[PDB]
Design a protein around this ligand. Structure first.
Ligand SMILES: CSC[C@H]1[NH2+][C@@H](c2c[nH]c3c(=O)[nH]cnc23)[C@H](O)[C@@H]1O
Ligand SMILES: CSC[C@H]1[NH2+][C@@H](c2c[nH]c3c(=O)[nH]cnc23)[C@H](O)[C@@H]1O
Ligand SMILES: CSC[C@H]1[NH2+][C@@H](c2c[nH]c3c(=O)[nH]cnc23)[C@H](O)[C@@H]1O
Ligand SMILES: CSC[C@H]1[NH2+][C@@H](c2c[nH]c3c(=O)[nH]cnc23)[C@H](O)[C@@H]1O
Ligand SMILES: CSC[C@H]1[NH2+][C@@H](c2c[nH]c3c(=O)[nH]cnc23)[C@H](O)[C@@H]1O
Ligand SMILES: CSC[C@H]1[NH2+][C@@H](c2c[nH]c3c(=O)[nH]cnc23)[C@H](O)[C@@H]1O
Lengths: 243, 243, 243, 243, 243, 243
């Protein structure tokens, strides 16, 4: 019996799952694996079974935004998933240090969403599993891929208006490294559901400089590949522990 | 250039736009019109130009969740859209009155999201445009399609937990009619950017009884058809004026 | 027995009720009707039965402020009232477009009070009934009286301080049309008590320019008379339907 | 130069001012003084200069509710008033100890309004001036009138609904003595404007027992007489000091 | 049986207790009394039974901070204490009037802590007992020591950052007189536990001018002695009553 | 000059610091090190330079409560500290798995304080540094000391009351491991000041079973000894990175 919105069965769910926001990215990633098996595609949720380094793990798209990815995350977590790693893009909150193309492996996030709050009080931290976190950094090292580490601001607001000030600058001063829209939700759902989570992101611009055109419609080819290698490598290594 | 994430151009945006959640729903709607022209399909945002009753209007999918649909709505509102109508599914909060298949035309909504709050203080109301509301009702009447009218709870939480209590029962007692995940965001964004909004929904179950099987993976055919006719009819009438 | 604070019996309550802020305004209004019957006068709550176009409906003063009018509204809603229309004065939040004398028929409001929050969560919208809004607009048409439509900011703070910044500016940018002190409370109570509500206001100045003398201790003669015609006309139309 | 809503000049404002909720109560009080001079009556605000023991001080009605009384209090504080004492009715939050007829002199209050919050952060205390509190108690002492002392809950909600629970039971457990609707607002405005405030109240019932009829529409005559004696005595003594 | 953290038995607790922040201060106080008896010293909590003017009362240190002092206060309140007077240092929020070495007796405080909020809603006031307040002022008058009276801001943040603005300026404008870190917590716990509280503080600088070196590592010698005399004098007077 | 409250100079602060709550604890710790140098003891803040396994690092007591420890943490972070590890006691929030004497190395915390909120928005996470977390775990491993890992609830309330429900059960359900009073504050301050933090705690009871006598007057001897060895070992390892 398929999951309400992912449209896959519990038996099709592997212990390690790699989630991305763009359903089209799932097709781009499956092709770089040793082999793959398409499972389903419903709404913005595309699921494919990946095979990498003799290891097996799913790759599912969660779509844009916290409320949307929460549906995906909850279905994965409540049906077998043990490790969920989000791989996506992000904006730099430190323009003088982190730039387009750079990779950042995050261990925690700012809960600027609503669903995590509807799940647990705001004082609760949005934090990833440090073993998952460690696995990601090690894979990066072994591949000789320099990366940044830090906190990501997960905000439900992509396009700000001019009435209520955005908190991005505050968080930049607070030393948050990047900003995206799903990590915190994944992390909180993960801890509440005893699922190990992690996150690796690649910068595609800086929201502080969008007016000056500091935004790339497309990610830096070379680096996107490196990040995916890191991500796949990690999932493989982590999967080995449940095989 | 094209809209950053919708991947359509400014000149391709019609004054009137029909938005739905499932990108697949867009293809099912375009084939009911007299003719159409596929525009783009990026992530969960599928855009198509619809031709119905001599009128021209777009149909765009916004995806699941307030943060994701916010990306879609902002691009549309900041690039020419004058009227946006959301057509989707919802759950009944008045099970003894509103049942599966029933249709509800909502005039306002509960802002249980975060993005709208990041845009304007919570005391501000999520309310639709009367003209659009009235147009939708006048079309249902002409088609002899009975509908309900009321407030929708737009909540970011689809799958509740056992720690923090859901506010759905409170809102039911407060006389809210249904519950879905995007209307309040559409409304507030519309108001802030001077875009007229409206919404028509079809009940697919009751959240108070999911644990009892009250959920249709498939919507009621005739009802869904009648809702789309109303939706399409409403868009045609409004488009005429702007034409 | 009599309503605790209105000092009128339940049987003296008509399905349609017109409420104003100033108890003295009730006298100024009872005169222009065909005839009337004074019911009571307790504190700032003055009740009178009005006879207009062969229709019976009460006119009750509610006083200044959300907490005060809430007492009035609850006693009415819980004892027979089916429709309540507030007619009063307001300040303009769009000075370049809305000026002294202008009439605005509002469909929703900003809940900047406390009592509505003590009744239901802040995410809940303060929105009036569509028929009442429609009825009021049409009556304005019939009488060839140009009127604005929009959202009203209902704030418990009339005289601002210099420590905590007023939110009026924010709301003006958010496109709120006018500002008064009781509409949101009326709307929420009505929605909760299944009572259709509506509001029509006359501009007596702009709070952004009070330091410039932009305030009329006396409302515009013809304009006020016109608004009153509209209100009475609307009450008449609605009372007929309930008979 | 009349005050916008009180309709009196800054010249008619005495340093000490006695405020009551009911404009009718002002008349019942002025005739118990040596002499009086009616000043004005607008909306629910009736002003009268009271003469007592050779002392001159005003008695003004402020209406029901924090938002409404705030207009009164600001106009008075911003135009001369140096001392403001509120004399009114209240409900008992300690049914086994405080009953109908009993008098309570309050030194502080719970800010369950909105206007005090729009003026200053919530953490700020609603507290009366010790001097006024002390004089009121001493006057009660001299007249041999027993009285309670304690905290009053100033809540904007008089008639509660059944969705959001009331905080009255919580405050009763916290040892709040009484409940009314204007004291917290007077205290905060007083502190902010450098005006000494105080409040004396007579119990008319218990909200926990309204369903039992524990509410007297009429205040115990003798008790009310004694309270006003205490109030007028205090106003005279304080008036002397400011002479 | 000994209290968990104060390490004294319930029988050793006197009806009146003088509390100070620094355990070192306890020792400096006991020697100024007629005679004393050391009870215990655990963590930062030092207890000593003081004998003064033929009266008996304890002097206990509560440490720096609301959370830390709450532990001390609860153990005292839940085990026999009837009166608790805090004597400590503070910063001036009115640099034009209250200078270093000046003494302020406070009647209420701003609740900028967390513990009091975990105990009761924020709207509840942090207010001291009148009798204790009055006793402190009378002892000051008898000793011919001029003192200020006013509200204290009890803030958990001593060293502010540059991201979130400090509320001290707002409170100075709201007329708060001084700032320290434990009074509000004492007051709220006292009210809840029916224990009479008070506070007397000596100014050690002004947080608005720390960058100008406006801070005394050592309190004004004579002033500190004067304050302690007032403090001990008050405890003696209040202790007599329970004796 | 000296730090205002720690009373040590900037030059006396080592890059790595070990903080504990009880000042008496640093004397019990310094004695197990190779040698030490007492620096100062002011209020509840005792500082001693420890020499262990060829490295030098300070051991400083911070007292009970977040507000108090923030003073200590801020003085250290703004004056040279690069690594701060907290070693203290805690309560078990999972009494069926974590019992008296068990050791828990925490990587994140619940911000149930106030000071962290006065420094940065609540959505920000309280999370420790991975290097520190990893070092602590590796040291426990080397010493064959089993330990738990998890989130700690840092709450300013030690003794709850019966009015406002404690959120501990909620956090237990959310899978928080233990509860104490200072970790979250240390974490947030460190993230903001660019200082690496960590925490290791020994369980001395369970808040859910205090009434049934589930409290440890004294920490389990051999377990406390082991945790101290782990903490001292971690500090030395981290210190070498700055030697
Ligand atoms: C508008 S859809 C953008 C997606 N890409 C990520 C993202 C990249 N750059 C930025 C940025 O600058 N701000 C906020 N989100 C993103 C977010 O997590 C969304 O899933
Ligand atoms: C999680 S996918 C559900 C979508 N369908 C709508 C919906 C239908 N029924 C319900 C319900 O019972 N609760 C919340 N949302 C919905 C929402 O707007 C989402 O876009
Ligand atoms: C406080 S007395 C003013 C009354 N008239 C209305 C009003 C008119 N103009 C304004 C304004 O500029 N600000 C706030 N309220 C009003 C409010 O609803 C009150 O009942
Ligand atoms: C509804 S008008 C009641 C007025 N009398 C006072 C009052 C008396 N008894 C109670 C009670 O039980 N609850 C709340 N307010 C009051 C309040 O301060 C209002 O000005
Ligand atoms: C941070 S240690 C300072 C202690 N002395 C008091 C204090 C003196 N001056 C000030 C000030 O300017 N701001 C905040 N607290 C204090 C507080 O109540 C603490 O217990
Ligand atoms: C109030 S003395 C308790 C100290 N020991 C720690 C502690 C041990 N057990 C518990 C508990 O069950 N709840 C809260 N704190 C603690 C806290 O961090 C304080 O510094």
């Amino acid at each position: 019996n398929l999951l309400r919105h992912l449209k896959i069965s519990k038996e099709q769910i592997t212990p390690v799952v790699l989630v991305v926001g763009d359903p089209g990215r799932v097709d781009k990633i499956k092709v770089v694996c040793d082999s793959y098996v398409d499972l389903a595609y419903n709404r913005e949720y595309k699921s494919v079974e990946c095979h990498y380094k003799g290891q097996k793990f799913l790759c599912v798209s969660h779509g844009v935004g916290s409320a949307g990815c929460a549906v995906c995350f909850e279905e994965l977590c409540q049906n077998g998933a043990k490790v969920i790693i989000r791989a996506g893009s992000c904006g730099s909150l430190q323009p003088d240090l982190i730039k387009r193309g750079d990779i950042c492996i995050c261990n925690a996030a700012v809960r600027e969403d609503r669903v995590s709050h509807l799940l647990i009080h705001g004082d609760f931290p949005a934090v990833g599993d440090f073993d998952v976190y460690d696995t990601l950094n090690k894979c990066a090292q072994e591949l000789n891929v320099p990366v940044f580490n830090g906190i990501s601001v997960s905000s439900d607001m992509y396009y700000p208006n001019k009435i209520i000030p955005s908190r991005l600058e505050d968080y930049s001063k607070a030393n948050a490294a990047v900003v995206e829209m799903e990590l915190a939700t994944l992390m909180v759902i993960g801890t509440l559901r005893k699922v190990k989570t992690g996150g690796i992101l690649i910068v595609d611009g800086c929201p502080f400089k969008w007016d000056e055109g500091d935004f790339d419609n497309n990610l830096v080819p070379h680096q996107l590949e490196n990040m995916i290698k890191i991500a796949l490598g990690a999932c493989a290594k982590l999967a080995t522990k449940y095989a």
